[PDB]
Amino acid sequence: TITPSLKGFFIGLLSGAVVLGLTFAVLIAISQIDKVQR
Amino acid sequence: MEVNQLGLIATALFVLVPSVFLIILYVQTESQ
Amino acid sequence: MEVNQLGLIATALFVLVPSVFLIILYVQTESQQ
Amino acid sequence: METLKITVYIVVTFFVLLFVFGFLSGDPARNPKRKD
Amino acid sequence: ARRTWLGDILRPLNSEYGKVAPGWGTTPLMAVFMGLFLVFLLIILEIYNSTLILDGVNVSWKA
Amino acid sequence: RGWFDILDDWLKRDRFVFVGWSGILLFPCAYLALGGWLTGTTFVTSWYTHGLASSYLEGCNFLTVAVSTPANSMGHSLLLLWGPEAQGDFTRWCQLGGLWTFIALHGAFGLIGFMLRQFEIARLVGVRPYNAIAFSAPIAVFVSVFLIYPLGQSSWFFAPSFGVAAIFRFLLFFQGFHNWTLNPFHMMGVAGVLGGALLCAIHGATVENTLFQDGEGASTFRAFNPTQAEETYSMVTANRFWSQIFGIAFSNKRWLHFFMLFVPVTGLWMSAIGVVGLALNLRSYDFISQEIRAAEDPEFETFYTKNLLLNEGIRAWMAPQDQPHENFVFPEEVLPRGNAL
Amino acid sequence: EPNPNRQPVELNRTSLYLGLLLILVLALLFSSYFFN
Amino acid sequence: MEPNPNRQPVELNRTSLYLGLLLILVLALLFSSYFFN
Amino acid sequence: DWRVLVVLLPVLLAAGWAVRNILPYAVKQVQ
Amino acid sequence: METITYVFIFACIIALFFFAIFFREPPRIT
Amino acid sequence: METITYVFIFACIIALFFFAIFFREPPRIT
Amino acid sequence: GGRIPLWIVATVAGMGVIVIVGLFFYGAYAGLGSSL
Amino acid sequence: ANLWERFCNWVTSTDNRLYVGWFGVIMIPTLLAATICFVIAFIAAPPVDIDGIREPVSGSLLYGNNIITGAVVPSSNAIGLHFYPIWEAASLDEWLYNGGPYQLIIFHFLLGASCYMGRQWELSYRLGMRPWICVAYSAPLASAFAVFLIYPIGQGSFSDGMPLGISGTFNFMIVFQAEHNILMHPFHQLGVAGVFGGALFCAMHGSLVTSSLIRETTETESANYGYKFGQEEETYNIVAAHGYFGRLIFQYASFNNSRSLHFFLAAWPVVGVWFTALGISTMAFNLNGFNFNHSVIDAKGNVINTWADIINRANLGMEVMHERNAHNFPLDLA
Amino acid sequence: SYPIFTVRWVAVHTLAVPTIFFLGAIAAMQFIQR
Amino acid sequence: GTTGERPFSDIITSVRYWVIHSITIPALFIAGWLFVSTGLAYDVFGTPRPDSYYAQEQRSIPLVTDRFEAKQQVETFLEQLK
Ligand code: CLA
Ligand code: CLA
Ligand SMILES: C=Cc1c(C)c2cc3nc(c4c5[nH]c(cc6nc(cc1[nH]2)C(C)=C6CC)c(C)c5C(=O)[C@@H]4C(=O)OC)[C@@H](CCC(=O)OC/C=C(\C)CCC[C@H](C)CCC[C@H](C)CCCC(C)C)[C@@H]3C
Ligand SMILES: CC(C)=CCC/C(C)=C/CC/C(C)=C/CC/C(C)=C/CC/C(C)=C/CC/C(C)=C/CC/C(C)=C/CC/C(C)=C/CC/C(C)=C/CC1=CC(=O)C(C)=C(C)C1=O
Ligand SMILES: CCCCCCCCCCCCCCCC(=O)OC[C@H](CO[C@@H]1O[C@H](CS(=O)(=O)O)[C@@H](O)[C@H](O)[C@H]1O)OC(=O)CCCCCCCCCCCCCCC
Ligand SMILES: CC1=C(/C=C/C(C)=C/C=C/C(C)=C/C=C/C=C(C)/C=C/C=C(C)/C=C/C2=C(C)CCCC2(C)C)C(C)(C)CCC1
Ligand code: OEY
Ligand SMILES: [Cl-]
Ligand SMILES: [Cl-]
Ligand SMILES: [Fe+2]
């Protein structure tokens, strides 16, 4: 059975995942364009 | 003064044990 | 038992000072050969 | 105390004069390079 | 070196020094476990902190 | 080239501000500690948690603004924005002290990120990581003072609030309640910080006043090439100077600069230990033998008893306003006071 | 069959002096608290 | 000025160490009761 | 309410005016 | 404390016994 | 005994100073 | 790139901070936080 | 030559194990007298009526102190700023009671240390060195003058100078905060930046030079043996330390001139401690820390407390208890 | 031939623009009466 | 050397720079001004205005005393102000 703080818990969990996602999606994207050359 | 009389032996060994350690390492250094 | 308090420090030093002296001379002896 | 005061006055005075005279004894030339 | 009976018996257990699976091996799987452990620790920490309150869980000496 | 390796390349690019993997932890958490401090000292009160104004908005100045700790009633709550106390309400979060945990915890992870940054850059450039090791001392201080100490106490209320005068308050609390000056672990930290300042000044002055003449100008700064092979100052004359001024001197350049790392880093570590003690009220508050004598002999007085009388004055005169959640009521007649004042 | 990882150990005079000052000053600092 | 020519190395072999430590420990064992009294 | 508008107005102006003033040089960013 | 001292010394002697036997200077012929 | 202990430790340090100045390993230019 | 002499931007910038800072010191005496 | 010239040459010899010099001629006797008196008084001196109220404070080990509580106690308030040499007392017993050893120790010590500073200049001249080490030392010396001379002058009594003891130092600091709100004084805040920053830059420089030692040794010996005293060359790679530190922050927040870097290490703590010595010296004349007590008030006029008001309640606790028998009138004006 | 938008660029604007905005905020506060 | 970017001495002496920043800077400043002058900052952050620290006749402080009732505790104190 689900309480308010568990719904809180999931919110922040989801919230933190999305933040992670943007950052690494943004970054992989960029690093794929601006590439070192050898 | 009503001090802790175990303080004397604590202080004495606090000093003697580590000092001896140092002296021993130093002297065997000077002898090689 | 109602025992002489300084007996403890006396015993420790009595053991420690002479013993430490011997070890000092032993170890610096081994480091020569 | 009177005896103390005089002895300290003389001690101090002696040490003061050593200080003054030593610096007057051509202190600028006591250096490892130029004796002006 | 010295051989012993017990040594000979153990000898295979200490034989693959330096053996490795190629490249990335099970790293993706390990990260999944790590992430799972993290959230599991977060749940334990927050129950103890009373930031997460669950039905029937009374974080109090009265349990 | 895997995508991990392409991301690695870009994160370790030589740019004006090196990023790195550690950057992914460092830049967000540091920005948000900073930003939450600026935001809270500029706009947020401490009225419901402390009975105090604490922002420019309320008319505080740069000395008296703070992000203040949460009310004692919050215990050691993480005070997450989405948690049970504030329930996602940003305005109520601010009012209950969420910015304090926000700053504290992002700051903690930002210091982690900085140390890993020191590790990450040392490895790429190829030098030993003694700077990162040195940074363990600031980290121990921060963890001990801001996290451990309040976790041993009744709540985050009694941690340091993030402000100039708020910290001064903390200093004096620690004197009046913990007798922290009497604590040998602080005494050692003092020795290490004042000894580090001493080392800093005497090494700088020694180098500057033993330089070799390597240019012909009066400004001596222009006579140094970072690529030169030669020492820019004289270890030999420095050594003689201090041997005859002070009796002993350094002779080994490596030992000297290792000693400069060691002294302050070791001092802050020792101070951290004592605060861990005070997390538990495990104080060096008293000397039992003086108290036995003093209680019996009303003519016995030392600077140690004089200082306790001052501690006693601090506790009683400051606790009612400092710990408002206790509703301390002290009638005038119980307040300790010497004659006249 | 003598063990080849054996190493000789050293402590020079300066290190002894430093280490003795450390111990003695620590004793002087902590002793008041040991007597209490 | 010359370094002093009368200096000599000192030796205590391992057997002498064992003997002397036994002496001290047994002396300690005998007199400790009287020190405590 | 009405105040969320005025506090962002100068921000947005500031943004367009630099966005219009640097837009061509930014289109460079193409390799 | 007296009991601990007595037994401590006795324990050191027993340890010494151990080293004097198994960790002696091994006598070597001529 | 406490006074004697404090003064003894303080006196050993003063002697340490003497040896550390006058009986230092001389810094030599090798 | 370089159409405005650096010394001019510096003076301008400087006088700009002096104003804001000066204003904050004025505020210490006026209105909120002036004790009045 | 003649006798006075042999003597001058000895005094200023760069070959004495310890340099004497003309400043040394004053320094040696004054420090010796200060040291011998301090050691004897600390152990054996009887209680001293510091505040002039016939309420003697025991400062010495034989009268029930330990290393932490013991002190040489400042001279009596009854004396104020009067000179109280031994010969001005009717007996050593009177001199001990009124705190005379304190005057003797601090005067001989300020003199001795003032000459220690001159000695640092003097030897640097005989050695052909640049002269400003002594300038660095002026910061600590200035600080000692403040707590032992200047603050007693402003306040009118050596009884308010700093005691010569561990706990006595704390007493002096707590009373000071109560009477001058030193925490809220910018010169003291500059002192804290000085010493904190000095500790920081101390750890930084050491860490950064140690980080870039040139491999000149094996893993089994101390790295230190990779440096030989007087070696022509340098044993660390400053260019590599810049390469590390320039990237840690950014390239121009980092020093690449060894001379500029070391000048900075000298100046930061020295300047800051100059300011905090000047802070004690000006609070000596009761120009005190910022006062923001009841500075915030609401539309009606209620006081809305700040952290400055909370400090003030601690200060007040110090104020009303310190020297609890010494005040007869409601204001403590010095 | 330089870029104009860079990581550095982002670094300076994440700071500078909140800083200016805060400065006007604080400026206005000087004129609040009670 | 150079990590590649455009030198600062170069940008801020540039005209294009000040074309862009003669606008953005003052605008940001005014945005902040308005944030306080509109009274918005007060309601966003829950900061008392000079007239809302106390009720007209009260002298005690709205100190929060409960951990989970705390949001309700603050809201009920804000009722009694009117
Ligand atoms: C380095 C970045 C970083 C870090 C370390 C933190 C860390 C923190 N933040 Mg901050 N935050 C960040 C960036 C960051 N934040 C940014 C960019 C913002 C702006 C959006 C914020 C805004 C913010 C707010 C407003 C608040 C925090 C809060 C917190 C704290 C609670 C975190 C929490 O419970 O998350 C829970 C979520 C996670 C731990 C994410 C877990 C990641 C996923 C879901 C794991 C699932 C893995 C899966 C099972 C396995 C897959 C494996 C993989 C290989 C695929 C914590 C100290 C709170 C705080 O300080 O309260 C006092 C709070 O209120 N943060
Ligand atoms: C974290 C908190 C903190 C920190 C970091 C500091 C830091 C400092 N405080 Mg502040 N203070 C604080 C809290 C703090 N304080 C609080 C809470 C209070 C209120 C209770 C005060 C009240 C206060 C007062 C009242 C004073 C300070 C002073 C100082 C300075 C002391 C160091 C100094 O004077 O060096 C300067 C160096 C010296 C004093 C040393 C001189 C050395 C002489 C010349 C040589 C001695 C030789 C020796 C006898 C023999 C050695 C021989 C040996 C080799 C055998 C420093 C800037 C002091 C200050 O500014 O003094 C100027 C001061 O008087 N503080
Ligand atoms: C108050 C004293 C003090 C301060 C302010 C300070 C500051 C700093 N020290 C640093 C470094 C160091 N400090 C060192 C030794 C020491 N540092 C010391 C004392 C201090 N050090 C002492 C005494 C020592 C001796 C052991 C070393 C060895 C280093 C470094 O290598 C490093 C460096 O490069 O400096 C040159 C820098 C770390 C940069 C960083 O984390 O960026 C990232 C920023 C983060 C993670 C944000 C942290 C948020 C903090 C923890 C909480 C919030 C703070 C609020 C924003 C402001 C609150 C303000 C109120 C308190 C008034 C930073 C400049
Ligand atoms: C009994 C009675 C009568 C006694 C009086 C009692 C009295 C009150 C005494 C009490 C003493 C007391 C209790 C002491 C307490 C001290 C205390 C708290 C101990 C701290 C303990 C401790 C381990 C702390 C941990 C932190 C720590 C490591 C601190 C170390 C501080 C320290 C030693 C710093 C060094 C200070 C110093 C003077 C440096 C000298 C260096 C020097 C010679 C530089 C010159 C130099 C510079 C160059 O640049 C070059 C190039 C060359 C060549 C060169 O030479
Ligand atoms: C309108 C408002 C009113 C305006 C008022 C203006 C006030 C500003 C005063 C300006 C003072 C001038 C700077 C100081 C002198 C200087 O240049 O030093 C000379 C050297 C030369 O630098 C070096 O310069 C060299 C070139 S040369 O020597 O200049 O020729 C070069 O080789 C080297 O790389 C470089 O580092 O500077 C350096 O070594 C760099 C470090 C600078 C350190 C700052 C000065 C001392 C700090 C004391 C502060 C302590 C704070 C207290 C802490 C609690
Ligand atoms: C918290 C939070 C957050 C974030 C935030 C942020 C990020 C912020 C930012 C902020 C910022 C980032 C701000 C800044 C500001 C700044 C300022 C406020 C500055 C000022 C300064 C000044 C005033 C100075 C000046 C001066 C002086 C004083 C003296 C010397 C000279 C000079 C000129 C330097 C979020 C979103 C998550 C949400 C939740 C919460
Ligand atoms: O601070 Mn309070 O003030 Ca300067 O004097 Mn009046 O009392 Mn007393 O003797 Mn020492 O102390
Ligand atoms: Cl007092
Ligand atoms: Cl009076
Ligand atoms: Fe150096």
PDB file of N, CA, C and O in Angstrom, chain F residues 273-293:
ATOM      1  N   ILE F 273      38.922  15.474  14.819  1.00  0.00           N
ATOM      2  CA  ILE F 273      38.738  14.426  15.809  1.00  0.00           C
ATOM      3  C   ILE F 273      38.036  14.978  17.026  1.00  0.00           C
ATOM      4  O   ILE F 273      37.091  14.378  17.546  1.00  0.00           O
ATOM      5  N   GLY F 274      38.441  16.155  17.484  1.00  0.00           N
ATOM      6  CA  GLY F 274      37.831  16.687  18.685  1.00  0.00           C
ATOM      7  C   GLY F 274      36.376  17.054  18.486  1.00  0.00           C
ATOM      8  O   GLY F 274      35.544  16.910  19.388  1.00  0.00           O
ATOM      9  N   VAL F 275      36.045  17.566  17.320  1.00  0.00           N
ATOM     10  CA  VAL F 275      34.645  17.857  17.075  1.00  0.00           C
ATOM     11  C   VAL F 275      33.826  16.567  17.055  1.00  0.00           C
ATOM     12  O   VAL F 275      32.704  16.526  17.570  1.00  0.00           O
ATOM     13  N   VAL F 276      34.371  15.485  16.507  1.00  0.00           N
ATOM     14  CA  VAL F 276      33.655  14.213  16.620  1.00  0.00           C
ATOM     15  C   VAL F 276      33.379  13.912  18.088  1.00  0.00           C
ATOM     16  O   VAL F 276      32.265  13.537  18.459  1.00  0.00           O
ATOM     17  N   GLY F 277      34.362  14.143  18.957  1.00  0.00           N
ATOM     18  CA  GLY F 277      34.115  14.002  20.388  1.00  0.00           C
ATOM     19  C   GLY F 277      32.919  14.807  20.869  1.00  0.00           C
ATOM     20  O   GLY F 277      32.060  14.286  21.595  1.00  0.00           O
ATOM     21  N   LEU F 278      32.884  16.118  20.508  1.00  0.00           N
ATOM     22  CA  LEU F 278      31.813  17.062  20.867  1.00  0.00           C
ATOM     23  C   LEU F 278      30.457  16.736  20.218  1.00  0.00           C
ATOM     24  O   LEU F 278      29.421  17.135  20.754  1.00  0.00           O
ATOM     25  N   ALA F 279      30.432  16.033  19.085  1.00  0.00           N
ATOM     26  CA  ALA F 279      29.170  15.456  18.590  1.00  0.00           C
ATOM     27  C   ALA F 279      28.419  14.725  19.688  1.00  0.00           C
ATOM     28  O   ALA F 279      27.191  14.775  19.743  1.00  0.00           O
ATOM     29  N   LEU F 280      29.154  14.164  20.649  1.00  0.00           N
ATOM     30  CA  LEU F 280      28.631  13.368  21.748  1.00  0.00           C
ATOM     31  C   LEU F 280      28.674  14.097  23.094  1.00  0.00           C
ATOM     32  O   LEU F 280      28.536  13.447  24.151  1.00  0.00           O
ATOM     33  N   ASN F 281      28.941  15.410  23.097  1.00  0.00           N
ATOM     34  CA  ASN F 281      29.293  16.120  24.331  1.00  0.00           C
ATOM     35  C   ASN F 281      30.457  15.454  25.085  1.00  0.00           C
ATOM     36  O   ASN F 281      30.579  15.580  26.309  1.00  0.00           O
ATOM     37  N   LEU F 282      31.318  14.712  24.397  1.00  0.00           N
ATOM     38  CA  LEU F 282      32.530  14.168  25.025  1.00  0.00           C
ATOM     39  C   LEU F 282      33.588  15.289  25.033  1.00  0.00           C
ATOM     40  O   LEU F 282      34.502  15.361  24.207  1.00  0.00           O
ATOM     41  N   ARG F 283      33.425  16.203  25.977  1.00  0.00           N
ATOM     42  CA  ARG F 283      34.221  17.418  26.040  1.00  0.00           C
ATOM     43  C   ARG F 283      35.398  17.203  26.951  1.00  0.00           C
ATOM     44  O   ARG F 283      35.363  16.393  27.867  1.00  0.00           O
ATOM     45  N   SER F 284      36.438  17.986  26.723  1.00  0.00           N
ATOM     46  CA  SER F 284      37.395  18.265  27.778  1.00  0.00           C
ATOM     47  C   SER F 284      36.932  19.563  28.457  1.00  0.00           C
ATOM     48  O   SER F 284      37.395  20.661  28.158  1.00  0.00           O
ATOM     49  N   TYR F 285      35.981  19.430  29.375  1.00  0.00           N
ATOM     50  CA  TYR F 285      35.385  20.617  29.950  1.00  0.00           C
ATOM     51  C   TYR F 285      36.079  21.026  31.242  1.00  0.00           C
ATOM     52  O   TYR F 285      36.349  22.207  31.447  1.00  0.00           O
ATOM     53  N   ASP F 286      36.427  20.060  32.080  1.00  0.00           N
ATOM     54  CA  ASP F 286      36.864  20.294  33.428  1.00  0.00           C
ATOM     55  C   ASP F 286      38.187  19.608  33.716  1.00  0.00           C
ATOM     56  O   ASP F 286      38.665  18.740  32.980  1.00  0.00           O
ATOM     57  N   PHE F 287      38.781  20.019  34.817  1.00  0.00           N
ATOM     58  CA  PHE F 287      39.885  19.299  35.428  1.00  0.00           C
ATOM     59  C   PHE F 287      39.366  18.899  36.796  1.00  0.00           C
ATOM     60  O   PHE F 287      39.136  19.764  37.654  1.00  0.00           O
ATOM     61  N   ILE F 288      39.138  17.601  36.999  1.00  0.00           N
ATOM     62  CA  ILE F 288      38.462  17.180  38.225  1.00  0.00           C
ATOM     63  C   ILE F 288      39.237  17.658  39.449  1.00  0.00           C
ATOM     64  O   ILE F 288      38.659  18.132  40.434  1.00  0.00           O
ATOM     65  N   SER F 289      40.555  17.475  39.432  1.00  0.00           N
ATOM     66  CA  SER F 289      41.356  17.851  40.602  1.00  0.00           C
ATOM     67  C   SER F 289      41.195  19.324  40.964  1.00  0.00           C
ATOM     68  O   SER F 289      41.154  19.667  42.148  1.00  0.00           O
ATOM     69  N   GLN F 290      41.075  20.216  39.984  1.00  0.00           N
ATOM     70  CA  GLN F 290      40.849  21.629  40.340  1.00  0.00           C
ATOM     71  C   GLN F 290      39.493  21.832  40.985  1.00  0.00           C
ATOM     72  O   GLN F 290      39.334  22.726  41.833  1.00  0.00           O
ATOM     73  N   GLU F 291      38.485  21.060  40.538  1.00  0.00           N
ATOM     74  CA  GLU F 291      37.130  21.248  41.034  1.00  0.00           C
ATOM     75  C   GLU F 291      37.008  20.724  42.442  1.00  0.00           C
ATOM     76  O   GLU F 291      36.345  21.338  43.289  1.00  0.00           O
ATOM     77  N   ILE F 292      37.682  19.614  42.732  1.00  0.00           N
ATOM     78  CA  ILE F 292      37.674  19.102  44.096  1.00  0.00           C
ATOM     79  C   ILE F 292      38.281  20.127  45.051  1.00  0.00           C
ATOM     80  O   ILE F 292      37.662  20.516  46.044  1.00  0.00           O
ATOM     81  N   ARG F 293      39.482  20.609  44.731  1.00  0.00           N
ATOM     82  CA  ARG F 293      40.126  21.675  45.507  1.00  0.00           C
ATOM     83  C   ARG F 293      39.239  22.919  45.637  1.00  0.00           C
ATOM     84  O   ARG F 293      39.036  23.444  46.731  1.00  0.00           O
TER      85      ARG F 293
END
